[PDB]
Motif scaffolding. Structure first.
Motif, PDB file in Angstrom:
ATOM      1  N   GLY A   7      77.351  27.536  63.676  1.00 59.52           N
ATOM      2  CA  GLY A   7      77.183  27.117  65.099  1.00 59.52           C
ATOM      3  C   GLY A   7      78.330  27.688  65.935  1.00 59.52           C
ATOM      4  N   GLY A   8      79.116  26.835  66.542  1.00 59.73           N
ATOM      5  CA  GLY A   8      80.258  27.319  67.373  1.00 59.73           C
ATOM      6  C   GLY A   8      81.246  28.082  66.489  1.00 59.73           C
ATOM      7  N   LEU A   9      82.098  27.375  65.790  1.00 56.44           N
ATOM      8  CA  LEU A   9      83.089  28.053  64.900  1.00 56.44           C
ATOM      9  C   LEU A   9      82.405  28.501  63.606  1.00 56.44           C
ATOM     10  CD1 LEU A   9      85.197  26.342  66.786  1.00 56.44           C
ATOM     11  CD2 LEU A   9      86.642  26.806  64.803  1.00 56.44           C
ATOM     12  N   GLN A  10      82.734  29.672  63.121  1.00 58.62           N
ATOM     13  CA  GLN A  10      82.103  30.175  61.864  1.00 58.62           C
ATOM     14  C   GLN A  10      82.843  29.630  60.639  1.00 58.62           C
ATOM     15  OE1 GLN A  10      79.764  33.985  61.743  1.00 58.62           O
ATOM     16  NE2 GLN A  10      79.177  31.908  62.065  1.00 58.62           N
ATOM     17  N   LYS A  11      82.978  28.327  60.541  1.00 58.92           N
ATOM     18  CA  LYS A  11      83.689  27.712  59.371  1.00 58.92           C
ATOM     19  C   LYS A  11      85.060  28.367  59.158  1.00 58.92           C
ATOM     20  CE  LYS A  11      79.734  25.852  57.146  1.00 58.92           C
ATOM     21  NZ  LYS A  11      79.107  25.889  55.795  1.00 58.92           N
ATOM     22  N   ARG A  12      85.635  28.910  60.202  1.00 56.79           N
ATOM     23  CA  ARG A  12      86.971  29.567  60.071  1.00 56.79           C
ATOM     24  C   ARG A  12      88.013  28.812  60.901  1.00 56.79           C
ATOM     25  NH1 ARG A  12      86.978  34.949  61.840  1.00 56.79           N
ATOM     26  NH2 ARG A  12      85.102  34.445  60.684  1.00 56.79           N
ATOM     27  N   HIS A  13      88.203  27.548  60.618  1.00 58.61           N
ATOM     28  CA  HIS A  13      89.206  26.746  61.385  1.00 58.61           C
ATOM     29  C   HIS A  13      90.332  26.272  60.460  1.00 58.61           C
ATOM     30  CE1 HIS A  13      85.881  24.478  59.620  1.00 58.61           C
ATOM     31  NE2 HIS A  13      86.742  23.494  59.354  1.00 58.61           N
TER      32      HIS A  13
END
Length: 99
Positions: A7-13
């Motif tokens: 969705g918004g962030l590509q699981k890269r947080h």
């Protein structure tokens, strides 16, 4: 799907933050504070601090909700260094909206 899972962030947080949508008063300022500081010294470019999701006891309000921090701790201990500050700063940052 080609772009239905992400969705918004590509699981890269940072870790299990995923921007806990709860309130926009003074909880977001704290997020950027410990989320970027730790990432700056943890994995500036290794994409490991990010596990995949987050604990559930934080909302289940079970008899032992305290397990929420212990779970995320080991879940990230394999990637994010062991630091009660990161685990606490997260569950404590949402101490006004979540529990």
């Amino acid at each position: 799907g080609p772009g239905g899972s992400p969705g918004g962030l590509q699981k890269r947080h940072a870790r299990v933050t995923v921007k806990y949508d709860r309130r926009e008063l003074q909880r977001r300022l704290d997020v950027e504070k410990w989320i970027d500081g730790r990432l700056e010294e943890l994995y500036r470019g290794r994409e490991a601090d990010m596990p995949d999701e987050v604990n559930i006891d934080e909302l289940l309000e079970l008899e032992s909700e305290e397990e929420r921090s212990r779970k995320i701790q080991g879940l990230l201990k394999s990637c994010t260094n062991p630091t009660e500050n990161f685990v606490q700063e997260l569950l404590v940052k949402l101490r006004g909206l979540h529990k």
